[PDB]
Structure formats: C-alpha cells, structure tokens
Amino acid sequence: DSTVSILPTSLPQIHRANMLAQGSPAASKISPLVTKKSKTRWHFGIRSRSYPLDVMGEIYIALKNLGAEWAKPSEEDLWTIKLRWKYIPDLMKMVIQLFQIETNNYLVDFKFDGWESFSAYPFLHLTTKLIMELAVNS
Amino acid sequence: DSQEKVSIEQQLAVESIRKFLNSKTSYDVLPVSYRLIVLDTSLLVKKSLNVLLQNSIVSAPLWDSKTSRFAGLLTTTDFINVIQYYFSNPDKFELVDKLQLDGLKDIERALGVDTASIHPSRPLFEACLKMLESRSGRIPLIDQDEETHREIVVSVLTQYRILKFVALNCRETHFLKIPIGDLNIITQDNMKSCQMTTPVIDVIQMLTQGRVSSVPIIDENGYLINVYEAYDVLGLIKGGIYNDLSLSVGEALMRRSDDFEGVYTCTKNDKLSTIMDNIRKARVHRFFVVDDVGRLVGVLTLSDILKYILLGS
Amino acid sequence: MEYTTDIPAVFTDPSVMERYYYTLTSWLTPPQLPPQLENVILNKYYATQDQFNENNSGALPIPNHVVLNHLVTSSIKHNTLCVASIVRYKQKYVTQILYTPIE
Numbered sequence A: 001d002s003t004v005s006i007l008p009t010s011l012p013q014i015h016r017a018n019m020l021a022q023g024s025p026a027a028s029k030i031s032p033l034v035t036k037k038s039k040t041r042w043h044f045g046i047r048s049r050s051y052p053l054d055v056m057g058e059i060y061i062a063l064k065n066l067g068a069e070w071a072k073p074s075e076e077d078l079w080t081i082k083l084r085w086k087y088i089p090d091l092m093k094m095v096i097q098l099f100q101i102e103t104n105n106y107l108v109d110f111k112f113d114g115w116e117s118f119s120a121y122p123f124l125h126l127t128t129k130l131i132m133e134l135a136v137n138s
Numbered sequence B: 001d002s003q004e005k006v007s008i009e010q011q012l013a014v015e016s017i018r019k020f021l022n023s024k025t026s027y028d029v030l031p032v033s034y035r036l037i038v039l040d041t042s043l044l045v046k047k048s049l050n051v052l053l054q055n056s057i058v059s060a061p062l063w064d065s066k067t068s069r070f071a072g073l074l075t076t077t078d079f080i081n082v083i084q085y086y087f088s089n090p091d092k093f094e095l096v097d098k099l100q101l102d103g104l105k106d107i108e109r110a111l112g113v114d115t116a117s118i119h120p121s122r123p124l125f126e127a128c129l130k131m132l133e134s135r136s137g138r139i140p141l142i143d144q145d146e147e148t149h150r151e152i153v154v155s156v157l158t159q160y161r162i163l164k165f166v167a168l169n170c171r172e173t174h175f176l177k178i179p180i181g182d183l184n185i186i187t188q189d190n191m192k193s194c195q196m197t198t199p200v201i202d203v204i205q206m207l208t209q210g211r212v213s214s215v216p217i218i219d220e221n222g223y224l225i226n227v228y229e230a231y232d233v234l235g236l237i238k239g240g241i242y243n244d245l246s247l248s249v250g251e252a253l254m255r256r257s258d259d260f261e262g263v264y265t266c267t268k269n270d271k272l273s274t275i276m277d278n279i280r281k282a283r284v285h286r287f288f289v290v291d292d293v294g295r296l297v298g299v300l301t302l303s304d305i306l307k308y309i310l311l312g313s
Numbered sequence C: 001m002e003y004t005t006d007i008p009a010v011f012t013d014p015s016v017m018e019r020y021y022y023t024l025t026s027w028l029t030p031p032q033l034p035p036q037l038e039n040v041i042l043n044k045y046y047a048t049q050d051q052f053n054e055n056n057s058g059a060l061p062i063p064n065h066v067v068l069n070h071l072v073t074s075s076i077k078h079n080t081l082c083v084a085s086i087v088r089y090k091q092k093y094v095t096q097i098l099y100t101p102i103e
C-alpha cells in the first residue's frame, strides 16, 4: 500500500560511496561534520570559595560600581540583599541570597523580584553585568 | 459507492481536524515545560551558528540588550545572506568573521535584499493561517510583559510541531484515504532543481531566488538522487569555509552529518493518512513525489499539507 | 523600604560583626542551601526534558515552584555567557536561556 520511502541515495553513507566510486577527489578529503553535543552542567547562581562577609563585601562593591541601590538589612537577614537597579516601571528589583553548601563552599543565589516606578531577559542581562563585574574584582 | 464513501470520510476527517484547530490555542501546543533559546544581538554570527548546532535547533529569537527589545529571528536565510555576501566580497573575510548579529542588517543592505507573530491565546487555526501567508515555516509566540508593557517571545511554533500535534491528538487522519494525486495539492509546475555537479553557491542562489526550503537533485534523466536543504548551509559555514564555496553540491553534501535522517519520497497514490503517520513518527519536512521508477514529478511540503487542511483542494 | 547606595557596615567595619559575636544561633551564618536548588536536581530536571524529546520517556519535568525566577548559570564557553531563568507562563514553564558575549 504505502509508497512512502526514505531515498537511499540521500543517506550520507550511500552518497559518499557513490561520490568515491565516481572518482571525486573531495570524497576522501571532506569528512562529515561531527557536532559533539556535549551536555552542559547547570547550576543555580554562582559558587564561591571565599567566606560569607568577604563574599557579601565583593557583591556590594560590584552593585555600587554598577549603579544599583539596596535596602538596609536587619540582623535576621544579613545574607539577603534586597536591591533595586535603574537599568512604564523604571527600577528592576532583585533579591540576592547567600547559601552555604560546605564550610568553604558558598552559593550566590539571584532572584528576579519585579519592577517599580513575563520576560526574564532584562534580569538575565543585568545578572550578566553583575557576574562579569564580580569576576574582574577577583 | 466505495469512492463516494472514501470521499465522505475524508471530508469527515478534514472537518474534524479543522474543528480541533479552531478549538485549540497555540499555547496548547506548548509542552508543560520547555526551553527557549535567545541570542543577544551583539553575539557573533560565527558563535550563534555553534549555539544552533549544539542545541539541535535551526532558529532562535534575537534580543537587543541596549533597547530591551526583541529583534526578529535568526534563521538559515540570515546565513544564506552571509554566504552570498562573502562569495560576492571574498576580500571581506575579516568583516564576515567578526560579524555580529546586529551587523546582519548592513549585509542585507549591501546585497539589496528585503515577520509574523501571534498571541499564544489565539486559536491555533489562526496561527496556522498567519504562518502560511507569512510564507514562513515558523511563527514566534509573542505576548505582553505584565510589568514593562513590552513584547515578549513565549516560544517559536513550527509547522512540523503543529502538524505533529494534530497527528498525535487526532487519529481520524487515518480516514484521509484520497490519493494526494487526486487532491491537487502537490506542486508539479516549475520545479526548481539542480544536478550533482551544480556549484553549491548556485543552489544556495536558487534557495533565496525561489523562496524554498530545498532544491531537489536529479540526474540527466530526471531521477531524484538527493536534495539540498537550506539547513545544510549551517553545516557548510561551520568552522569557517572559504575553499569550500565554489565546491559542487555533491561535494558539499559530504559535510552532512551521519545522523542525517534522509529524504522522504512518495507517489501520487499515497494517502494523507500515511503522510500524517510519518509526521507523527518522525521529523519529516517534505515528501518528494516520484513516479514508478523514481523520477521527480513534484513535492508535497508541510505548508502544502497544512494549506489543504485549512483551505481544501 | 528605604533605598540607598551605602554598603551595610557589617561588611565594611569589623566592629559590627564583632558586637554580634560578643553580645549574648543560626543567623550569624548564611542558611544551608535548600534541596530544591541543588544542581543534581536541576540537571535531572534537564535530563527528563531531553529524555522526552529524544527518547520519549515518562512525563515532562515540572519544575519545583521554589526555583522559579532564580538565575541559572553554566561555565563560560568561547567568551560567551549562558544564563537562564525558569519562569511561569500561565500553567506552563519556560526555561528562558540567554547567550551573550563577554565584550
């Protein structure tokens, strides 16, 4: 019934072999493109080997040089930065949080918090600026 | 009587598919969780090519970080333009190598060459219509950001995925038993084709000249041997190519990856039931219509299949 | 809240954290990482998506609602940064990925 087929000469192995039999010089020279699709390892935020106050110090310096503002933190939330960034609402809100993985291993978590007088790309672009500023200052 | 029966079940199957498209939104086609890959426009064309190949995609929305706006889609057409510009301007290798995605518009100007979207909540039928008439195989799903009041890409919807979505949900496709030859939906007239010795650059020229996704490759006697797709251009440009420009299509086709899924063929006596079966089981973008002995008579693309579903014979 | 560009003294002046240590519990140290934000979970969330589109296994990976709007990163490759955020669209979930160059 079905006359739906895959054209055999369209397959790489037959196409190559026909080109080689035709004597073509480029048959042996040209190799098939092998795209090594390597699985990327993903992490939330960025990790740091420095210690809490040092890390928190580094982050604030970056924030300040990048022109951001932030709230005054209380005793219960020292490792939380409630910030605002200039970049129709005008100011983007972010919440940065420091977590502990191990005694020498810490994670800097970045969270989009909204807008003040949906798409994550403005947020993603800004964190990009922030991540880059932090890498220089190291 | 039996041909009258076949005919009524076809109408029945078509009308059912249509109702499904009118009852669903583009949003419904979306997986419950999925990835959207967007490229900043200041990224190198060179590097954006690697991004597409690494992630098994052929398209990506563009984002302007300076203006906070989306800036259209990167597609194989953009890479055609770069190839054509370079071929015409082989002195400008350095410019092409350092070309950024936001520099793509200047390339277009130098060559003298001239985007639909849809709100996800809109009927899927309407998304099919807009895509057809935009003469594109893709439609960006754009909504409004609740805060910034800005246009946001939710996803990109392809013809293949829409047709697969139909196929998966609607097994009535089985009752589409009228041979495609009797449906007048195959393009037979003015087939743009080439031979194995045709320079790949000229085949690429045919791609933009005809505004088609592929060029069938025949022999002296009209037998279908292979096909050159716009997709193949990515493989051609990969890793920077200069000596491999004036190459023949036959030679260029050796760059094809070993996991190339092949070219699909059918005859006039094949049914859409079978066609939808294939779409449901594999990523097939077109079916080249051949005769008893394998000579090219025509082509049935996803746009032809979709056009029939929406509009009829 | 009131906003200003003045870095909290606790990170610039050793006297401040000293006072805390000395004036007679968990708040002196950053909180432990929530199980939801563990990279082993984040990538099995990635592997189940890849398992459905390349092999068709089980159901799609619904993200835990905790991780929504949090930055995802990977190693810098070819001077290109690759960041992401898992965000809500109606009842669906979009992992919005951005490739930007390091200029």
Ligand SMILES: NC(=O)C1=CN([C@@H]2O[C@H](COP(=O)(O)OP(=O)(O)OC[C@H]3O[C@@H](n4cnc5c(N)ncnc54)[C@H](O)[C@@H]3O)[C@@H](O)[C@H]2O)C=CC1
Pocket (backbone or CB within 6 Å): B077, B132, B134, B135, B136, B137, B159, B186, B187, B189, B190, B191, B192, B193, B207, B208, B210, B211, B212, B213, B214, B215, B216, B285, B286, B299, B300, B301, B302, B303, B304
């Ligand atoms: N640069 C452009 O404007 C381009 C536009 N497109 C458009 O994308 C839409 C959907 O694409 P697909 O489903 O891939 O269909 P397609 O791109 O293969 O569609 C081209 C139309 O002409 C026919 N066709 C295909 N190849 C042909 C050939 N080699 N010679 C003569 N006719 C040929 C098809 O049956 C179809 O009716 C179409 O409307 C197509 O025109 C595709 C590539 C480039």
